[PDB]
């Protein structure tokens, strides 16, 4: 529960420690079934407004079915496609005959049942909506006359409710070529999802975590539609399976670090590279570069290992002894000294250069701190907002202690004349070797 | 109203002048209220189709309420979160007891009223939909029988209209974890928004601008949902507050500038860096790097100062005397001479290199100009489209004069042998210093 | 139908050949019309629930019309705007009087008809919904009384169906400022689209391709709304027109290539630049850098030439003889040896460096291959997934042969001491020239 932060004055970086992990390592596939009604184009001679409204929505029903066949004609266009290979594999098994009828036989008794597929995969099936039973029992004998019948409007409105979810299904499948994420509430109702999470094979502790952070599970799950035949449409919904839980996570925040020399254009800078989410995973650390690829319920981190990067466990040494002999801490160099500010979880790192104003201000008591030229940090305690130049930043109000690690800025240890100031993705060893090789040429002079 | 453009032949860049500003500097928070009905699971013994449709939507009603509580269990996952700290602060004050009842007491008389919160913030409250009064007065005494009643269908359909907006609210909150942008029409009706803009504290001139460009205000506003208790759901909608209006804005367009030497691979190039939106703000210029972070009703520019960058006022000198002694104009160098074209607001900059065709063509009279090797500009007058290689570009038809600033291309002033041709983010001073230091080594030879 | 892949061991790259093209070269504009009803605010003295529901939706009807006028007040804010200049041009012609009435006269007889505009453009018009005829014939004489009438509910529900699509139109136009893509099913029904594709001028073969891959056409089409007047709203829907069909396409996949020296930090790397989609177009090759700018029904590639890049036909030589004297193959250099894996269409390229595990595993028989240090490739035959470190990758199951082109890795031909290892966007000639110039300084020593 304790959330900690440590600002590194020497490297102009901060690490937010005390976070718990939830890394997606596997995929669970579930087949969702809608029992459709195979009807041919009917036409009876009536002008009744009851049967007129039925024709309009039967057309919308028939159009959504025939268009979902047109989408079926479209081969999976998303990807990449590594992330959906499990759902595609289930779709391919549904093509085989004697598999669509297997689902139909197992779902006649109950709205949910486990089925063993031909590929040996044991998946749970769900008949969310039964259009077949309703349309044939309620609406078929009405319009099965020489002229359209005269039934009341109560049955027509209920038919609007049934057809409304199907229209919502085909409209989301069409714009996304049958692969939608996050899984909308119509692909799988929130009530249906919790029932699906309770069934699926994992512990009660792992089920409790997924059922509490539902929205995060929806954003890390794909809805894939596979086929339509035998009066049934089927689409597979992949669900994240998390194999790494409760391992240490920490987020690295980096800000430029320059010198404070007076004459303009005579300053060198460097910035810590590889900022983002770090989490221990199987004796190593998994790096997450892309922003918002990790979701975060407070104190818990949810990420996917597909957008990851494997790093050795010694990578955390760059947060203490950046000159460590074990790992190659990456930095980028430049002479651009623009004033910026990074909002970390328990404060804000501020890099103030030039004449631009840099202040941390509290709305009630006013400005509480004015930042001098350099890189510094302000604790979130008693600080509402932080301003840099003409840009206003707001500080997070998460409760926790923040530590200030004092240290000489490493940018002061380098000579500006032989300093390489255009290294996009370099390391300490490269900067150390490039300078010594540059000084090797000046000695021979 | 006058829109001007100036192409700089020396730097292969153009500036579109004559634009008015609208920079977001603050946030106004408004609490939106939906009076919910606290009902326990009712079950009466009836098969009437009137009461059957009620049960279906009451389940959808109860499910949307209980799921919106599940979303409430999810801590704010978006961000960052600087941009929503004001809305979060209002959400936290709503948690305190004696605050939810304060909103309920002030909204019993009118559908809108200003409320003073515990945090000293004066915010306007809105009861958009009153589900509590309708459900209890119209539907409670019907189903408050030993068996479900037999009321007509007119009341059931009206209940579908009320429940439809709530289902639209929870479905948008669920996919976005309660933070949606742009604010949809269901979070706040267009009619409700104009009424909210008229009330809010600002001048009639600032209210007239927001009420005219509604869609731009929606795209720069966040909908945040805070809590559900005491038969009321509440969600705060932040609205942009613009403190900078009618200050000069101009958009910088840059295109590569190479040499025209015949032998392949013997050409050097450079391109002006920091292209995008520039607007004067409080004695300085605010730079906007990210595209589409600024919206633009013609002749008016709408941007947010959070995605900004503060630059000194002398930054505009890079558009005239790029060799100015005051500011360090940034350029990037390379030897890649690919033919490209940038569509500016009143024409198009064309960089033609190699043998690729570069023509400005009018659909009625045909090709009007053929571009030679180098960087040039064509006015939008009498020009419909511009083609480069196999890529077709269309020119904007905005009315205004365009000026051609003749000048020797600066790429011709540099010696290709000592020229650094791999500078990602460099400046004129660095290129000037790097070449002189390279020539310092050849003199000692 | 044959899909081929060739892995290049010397360059650590693979090319997926055997694909067919479909490049968008032009735009076809179609005017979509909804005949609106011009009604003034009516108020009759009734409390009937039939006429009460009418007032609620007439307000939603009137609000959607008046708000769509507010959106009309917003000048086109999207772009750029090259891609929509054709639709904007049609919108501007609709402003001229005697043009809105021309559409109204030609659509009174049929729901679809071709119209010659003032700009000489021949466009097909579509009256998708006729709100004017329905509202005035069915609902006007009802409420045209001194007190609201007592008509039944069948007509009210049909009015809900008509007004529902209009509310769907204005809600999508509002969030996107009137420019939406992909074109939703409500901007143009799937049934209306196929009828539009059949009419439009092109061959039966080009019509058959568009009608089969409907969803891809929707994602490469824009819906633009132009004006509201004379009881008619109009919005233009641009449709892709493909001028390049059945030309060779191939996708280039690149992975880092490093050395295998034991001592850490003593390795140099290089990676092929310009990975993505390549397609021959008019005697040259069109390069597509941005991912997902090309859609892909299997065996067919759909791209837009606006996000393209024109390259000479000799660019394919970088896939065989990278040291070719005709073209300058671009590579980037670094010393970062991170283990990665690229999922190509018929396998996976794996770059294994360090101690990180690199295995290709089949779920039934287990691990089938362990990758040594370097860059290698594994065929999709009998391989389900491929793991690198803590990241799991899944292989595509597309059927086709894959060829292994053996060759000495070019990274072994370079001396690490004089090797430039920080070239972001460089070429072979630059690396060749930079090393020789570095060796020119060591000879004079």
UniProtKB/Swiss-Prot annotation, chains A, B, C:
Residues 81-93 are annotated as: Fusion peptide. The keyword Transmembrane applies. Changing residue 44 to S: Impairs translation or folding of the F protein. The lineage of its organism: Viruses, Riboviria, Orthornavirae, Negarnaviricota, Haploviricotina. Changing residue 303 to S: Impairs translation or folding of the F protein. Residues 1-445 are extracellular. Changing residue 294 to S: Impairs translation or folding of the F protein. Residues 51-71, 94-145, 417-445 form a coiled coil. Glycans are attached at residues 2, 45, 436. GO terms for molecular function: identical protein binding. GO terms for biological process: entry receptor-mediated virion attachment to host cell; fusion of virus membrane with host plasma membrane; symbiont entry into host cell; symbiont-mediated induction of syncytium formation. This is Fusion glycoprotein F0. Changing residue 148 to S: No effect on F1 and F2 structure and glycosylation. Belongs to the paramyxoviruses fusion glycoprotein family. Disulfide bonds join 12-375, 44-148, 249-279, 258-269, 294-303, 318-329, 352-358. Changing residue 329 to S: Impairs translation or folding of the F protein. It comes from Human respiratory syncytial virus A (strain A2). Keywords: Cleavage on pair of basic residues, Coiled coil, Disulfide bond, Fusion of virus membrane with host cell membrane, Fusion of virus membrane with host membrane, Glycoprotein, Host cell membrane, Host Golgi apparatus, Host membrane, Host-virus interaction, Lipoprotein, Membrane, Palmitate, Signal, Syncytium formation induced by viral infection, Transmembrane, Transmembrane helix, Viral attachment to host cell, Viral attachment to host entry receptor, Viral envelope protein, Viral penetration into host cytoplasm, Virion, Virus entry into host cell. Changing residue 269 to S: Impairs translation or folding of the F protein. One of its GO terms (cellular component) is plasma membrane. The chain holds residues 26 to 509 of 574 of the full protein. Changing residue 352 to S: Impairs translation or folding of the F protein.
